[PDB]
Design a protein around this nucleic acid. Structure first.
Ligand SMILES: [Mg+2]
Ligand SMILES: [Mg+2]
Ligand SMILES: [Mg+2]
Length: 430
DNA sequence: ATTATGACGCT
DNA sequence: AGCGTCATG
């Protein structure tokens, strides 16, 4: 009744750049614009591995994690851009720099949480209150929402996509109560107006297009963002949740696309998120633990409390390279050379980070994988990071991992290493 | 022979 | 601390 909380206290947006690395390459090279194109890492093995795909290329079935040679079988005219290689490894600096450009624009509208290289959550609650105060009870025109979809509409008693979008928006706006400054639906709508403005600013000032979701929490905003891509935004209201979730596979909700989600499905014998409502909070906690159970109980009703953290910068700065199959490192010279390459890239990135962001990392994490281990990381060990010096950092990493060499010989390394990873962590202001 | 990251939970 | 899970450009 009146005391059952409904999780409608915040306005949260998730902004996600469309096919991000592709857009960075298309800005730089106009010949790639409005073409089926993909971004690849490396080239010798099967043409390189695709990591980002333009929407034109997706129409042919090209996806991430596909080898370029196979993508070319699906789309012979596919255009490819290669990630830069420095010190023998992929170097993602261009995309990190482009990400900073976008995150700085977003931060003008509200405090953001950098969730990944190309996506950020936005807490718009206060900005919405402000814009509502300025509105003075004036209604929201559909002209202010030119790329917004309202999930679940139109409904009830034209065969073109834009026409359907507009009918849904008109139904939504007609049902809006514009005088209640505390109406959650009105707050979401104003949030969407703000996000239209933020997305327009990103495109004007960078050239990059993005999609966005607007809802009452991070999980719904992320889900909403995915409903209409690319270059569109979607409002998921609290009221839209029962219908949306009634046919939503559990794996589509963030955090449930892996083992936990598969166990929800198998243990409870359900398929869709809405089916979770039939279980008590204690039942869900008994199966999935106290934290997961309470989270599932609320989430399946559209309610989630995780805050938008005020954090625009990554918490760690890392450098990683796999040495698959026959390229695995089997000599101490090899291991030292690659640790040095990784450490030199890490030093460059850390020095730039210290100048830009007034902080210093204090912990170096070294991770390796040995040949034949199913896990992605075979061993992880930390040591002190007291100086931004690549030779020191690589020597320290070698000292930390050298007891892993099973070889009786000091020159050989066995079993050979299939992955090296150096990560700087535990930043302190300076 | 996917790869290169990056966040966060568990114990 | 070191490990596992989830994401997924
Ligand atoms: Mg994206
Ligand atoms: Mg993203
Ligand atoms: Mg993606």
């Amino acid at each position: 009744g009146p005391h059952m909380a409904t999780g409608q206290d915040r306005v949260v947006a998730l902004v996600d750049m469309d096919c991000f690395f592709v857009q960075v390459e298309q800005r730089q090279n106009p010949h790639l614009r409005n073409k089926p194109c993909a971004v690849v890492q490396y080239k010798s093995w099967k043409g390189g591995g695709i990591i980002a795909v333009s929407y034109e290329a997706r129409a042919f079935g090209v996806t991430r994690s596909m080898w370029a040679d196979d993508a070319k079988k699906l789309c012979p005219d596919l255009l490819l851009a290669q990630v830069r290689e420095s010190r023998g490894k992929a170097n993602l600096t261009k995309y990190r720099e482009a990400s900073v450009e976008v995150m700085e624009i977003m931060s003008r509208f509200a405090v953001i949480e950098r969730a990944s290289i190309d996506e950020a959550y936005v807490d718009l609650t206060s900005a919405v209150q402000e814009r509502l105060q300025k509105l003075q009870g004036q209604p929201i025109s559909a002209d202010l929402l030119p790329s917004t979809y309202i999930e679940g509409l139109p409904q009830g008693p034209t065969v073109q996509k834009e026409g359907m979008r507009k009918q849904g928006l008109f139904q939504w706006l007609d049902s809006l109560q514009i005088d209640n400054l505390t109406s959650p639906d009105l707050q979401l709508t104003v949030g969407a107006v703000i996000v239209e403005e933020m997305r327009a600013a990103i495109e004007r000032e960078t050239g990059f297009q993005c999609s966005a979701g607007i809802s009452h929490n991070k999980v719904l905003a992320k889900l909403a963002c995915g409903l209409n891509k690319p270059n569109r935004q979607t409002l998921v209201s609290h009221g839209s949740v029962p219908q949306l979730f009634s046919q939503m596979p559990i794996r589509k909700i963030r955090s449930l696309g892996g083992k936990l989600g598969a166990s929800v499905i198998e243990i409870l014998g359900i398929e869709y998120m809405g089916e979770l409502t039939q279980f008590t909070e204690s039942q869900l906690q008994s199966h999935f633990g106290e934290k997961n159970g309470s989270w599932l109980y609320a989430m399946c009703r559209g309610i989630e409390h995780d805050p938008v953290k005020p954090r625009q910068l990554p918490k760690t700065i890392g450098c990683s390279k796999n040495f698959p199959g026959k390229t695995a490192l089997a000599t101490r010279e090899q291991v030292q050379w690659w640790l040095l390459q990784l450490a030199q890239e890490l030093e460059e990135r850390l020095t730039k980070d210290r100048n830009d962001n007034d902080r210093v990392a204090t912990q170096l994490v070294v991770s390796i994988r040995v040949q034949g281990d199913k896990r992605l990381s075979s061993l992880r060990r930390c040591c002190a990071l007291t100086r931004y010096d690549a030779h020191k950092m690589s020597h320290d990493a070698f000292t930390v991992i050298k007891n892993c060499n099973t070889s009786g010989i000091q020159t050989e390394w066995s079993p050979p290493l299939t992955m090296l990873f150096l990560c700087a962590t535990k930043f302190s202001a300076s």
